[PDB]
């Protein structure tokens, strides 16, 4: 209901689970409650991939015909499109889970999976419709939704939405693009013909979870591991691998500065990727910033500690 | 860990030096830091609300 | 230990006489005791002199202020140790000069502790870490030995002062270093917002 | 005649594996303490770590 909806009912759960109402129609679910305390959750642990993929888990309930996404944690998966079936890292989090709230007297299962599509949008390739088809017939429900974390930079537009693929003998043969975003000029053709597989839903929000109170206790003795900065000797091969691809991208601009992608006839479009110059910049500051930034880790450190000395 | 020398028969062993002794150092003095919390509120928890408090008033 | 300290100084203030002297040499012997500073202040042992009781009176002075080498040169007048005795009195030596100097070089601690190789002598520094007695580590390229955690001797009357100075360096350098960054934010934030405003008023009269 | 030409490369093969289970320990190792462990001569010491 209204009042019923924002906290933890056991009644609301024991009468939807034990009938079932998704066998009949695939297209029960119309809108999507997300957590305003899990969305931050999603959209840091995508970032801090960068331009990996990776993929988490979300936990909630059910009420009619609008799901709720309560809390939500990551999963050390490398996403869903590199590794195929990466719902069996999962079943040890699953496993511990359903049994702790069984003896309590709660109901609470699993609600979906979320992931991370950075680069061509938030969108459904060829790979994450065909294991979402396994997955909803043995742990249903179950829900896809896409975070963009590249995109809400540049763009500043906060992306977010949630989709379903139909399973086998209800898609429908004509059906355009519900949520359509921007697509770079490579894997364009694909969403034109993948949206029919999928639709979008009206996603909305509220104030619950669960999941965002008990960290606080743990911060009380956990705050000893959340000072352990250096960057700079983390991921040390990250930064110097980088410059080895930089001079990759620095030797194709040599050639585009001398060849021009500005001939008599056929101007501006000769080149297949222009603007070489302008894209090896970014490239090259990027190995400046993840470099000084390691440093203020330790420059921080040498100033509070450091000039304490002793008499 | 370590090293044998073969030239005047003295062999070494590797105790962690250089960098990776500075980050154990900052994490090993913070975690004094988190014992003696715990020791301070168990012995008297009214003196860890009064010296909160001093922060805020200055 | 920390329970046995509160039993041996209850027992000193409810007799005296013959059975003080006697106590002396029990605290010693028995582990667990490195503390000796709420035993010489007080008057009970004060009263020990003339003949023997006199030579456990310096002894406990020797073990709070004094050292390895202050022991040797007077052993004709001092009572012998044991296999006991002679281990706690090097302990009490490693934290002696870390009460004075941050850094102790390998050099000092050979011809204090009388030794001929480096494992022999950090031989009775590793037996106090696992009693939460003396806590560092130990420094191969400089030949140093950095004592961060060890007993204090005593109750420290004398050495007290630097605990406080210590602190009010770590509470009031931060109000320092905290004025830097937050106007570093400041000024970050500044240049964004300058930047942005810069940037779309000169693209926008180009149409005009 | 067939297996006689290849009887020359077999033995070279060994000597490289056990220097390298040797040579991880001795930081500074002499030239003529490998050589004594491997029961050979000198002759062949210094031809055989050039090739390694």
């Known amino acids: ?159 977010l939405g949630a989709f379903r693929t139909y399973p086998k003998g209800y898609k429908p043969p004509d059906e355009g693009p519900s949520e359509y975003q921007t697509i770079p000029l490579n894997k364009i053709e694909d969403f034109g013909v993948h949206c029919k597989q999928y639709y979008a839903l009206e996603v909305s929000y509220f104030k619950s979870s669960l999941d965002r109170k008990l960290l606080e206790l743990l911060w009380n003795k956990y705050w000893v591991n959340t000072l352990s900065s250096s960057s700079l000797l983390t991921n040390a091969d990250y930064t110097t691998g980088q410059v080895f691809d930089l001079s990759e991208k620095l030797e194709q601009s040599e050639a585009q500065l001398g060849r021009g992608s500005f001939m008599l006839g056929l101007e501006t479009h000769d ?17 400046t910033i993840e470099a000084i930034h390691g440093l203020m880790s330790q420059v921080i450190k040498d100033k509070l500690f450091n000039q304490i000395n002793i008499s | 860990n370590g090293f044998i020398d073969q030239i005047d028969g003295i062999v070494h062993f590797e105790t962690r030096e250089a960098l990776p002794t500075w980050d154990k150092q900052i994490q090993s003095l913070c975690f004094q830091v988190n014992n003696l919390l715990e020791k301070i509120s168990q012995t008297a928890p009214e003196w860890t609300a009064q010296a909160m408090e001093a922060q805020m008033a200055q | 230990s920390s329970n046995l300290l509160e039993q041996f100084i209850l027992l000193a203030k409810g007799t005296s006489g013959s059975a003080l002297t006697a106590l002396i040499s029990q605290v010693l012997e028995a582990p667990g005791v490195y503390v000796f500073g709420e035993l010489l202040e007080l008057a009970n042992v004060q009263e020990l002199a003339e003949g023997a009781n006199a030579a456990y009176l310096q002894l406990l002075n020797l073990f709070a202020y004094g050292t390895y080498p202050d022991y040797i040169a007077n052993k004709e007048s001092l009572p012998e140790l044991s296999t006991a005795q002679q281990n706690k009195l090097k302990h009490l030596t490693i934290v002696s000069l870390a009460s ?32 939460d007695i003396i806590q560092g580590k130990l420094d191969q390229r400089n030949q140093l030995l950095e004592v961060d955690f060890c007993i204090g001797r005593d109750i420290r009357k004398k050495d007290i002062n630097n605990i406080v100075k210590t602190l009010h360096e770590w509470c009031d350098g931060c109000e320092a270093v905290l004025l830097g960054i937050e106007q570093q934010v400041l000024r970050a934030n500044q240049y964004k917002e300058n930047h942005n405003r810069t940037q779309q008023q000169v693209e926008a009269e180009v149409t005009n | 005649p067939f297996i006689r030409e290849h009887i020359e490369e077999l033995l070279r093969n060994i000597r490289t594996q056990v220097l390298i289970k040797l040579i991880k320990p001795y930081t500074r190792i002499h030239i003529p303490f490998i050589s004594k462990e491997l029961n050979i001569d000198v002759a062949d010491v210094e031809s055989l770590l050039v090739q390694c």
């Not at chain 1, 034990?18 to 297209?27: G, M």
């Not at chain 1, 888990?57 to 990466?86: H, Q, Y």
């Not at chain 1, 999962?90 to 991370?116: C, D, F, P, T």
Request: glycine residues 6%; neutral net charge; aromatic residues 8%.
């Open chain 1, 1 to 159: 209901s209204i009042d019923e909806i924002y906290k933890y009912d056991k009644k609301q759960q024991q009468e939807i689970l034990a009938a079932k109402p998704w066998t009949k129609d695939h297209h029960y679910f119309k809108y999507c409650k997300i957590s305003a305390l899990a969305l931050l959750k999603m959209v840091m642990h995508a970032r801090s991939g960068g331009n990996l993929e990776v993929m988490g888990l979300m936990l909630g309930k059910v009420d009619g015909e609008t799901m709720i996404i309560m809390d939500s944690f990551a999963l050390p998966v490398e996403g869903t499109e590199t590794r195929v079936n990466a719902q069996a890292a999962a079943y040890e989090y699953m496993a511990a889970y359903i049994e702790n709230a069984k003896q309590v007297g709660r109901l609470e299962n699993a609600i979906g999976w979320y992931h991370s599509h950075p680069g061509y949008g938030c969108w459904l390739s060829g790979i994450d419709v065909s294991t979402q088809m396994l997955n909803q017939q043995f742990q249903e429900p179950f829900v896809a939704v896409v975070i963009d974390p590249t995109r809400t930079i540049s763009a500043g537009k906060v992306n």
């Open chain 1, 271 to 287: 080149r297949k990727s222009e603007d070489k110059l302008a894209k090896a910049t970014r490239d090259s500051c990027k190995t």
């Open chain 3, 100 to 131: 004075r100097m941050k850094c102790i070089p390998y050099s000092v601690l050979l011809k204090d502790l009388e030794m001929r190789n480096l494992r022999e002598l950090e031989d009775l520094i590793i037996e106090a870490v696992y009693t």
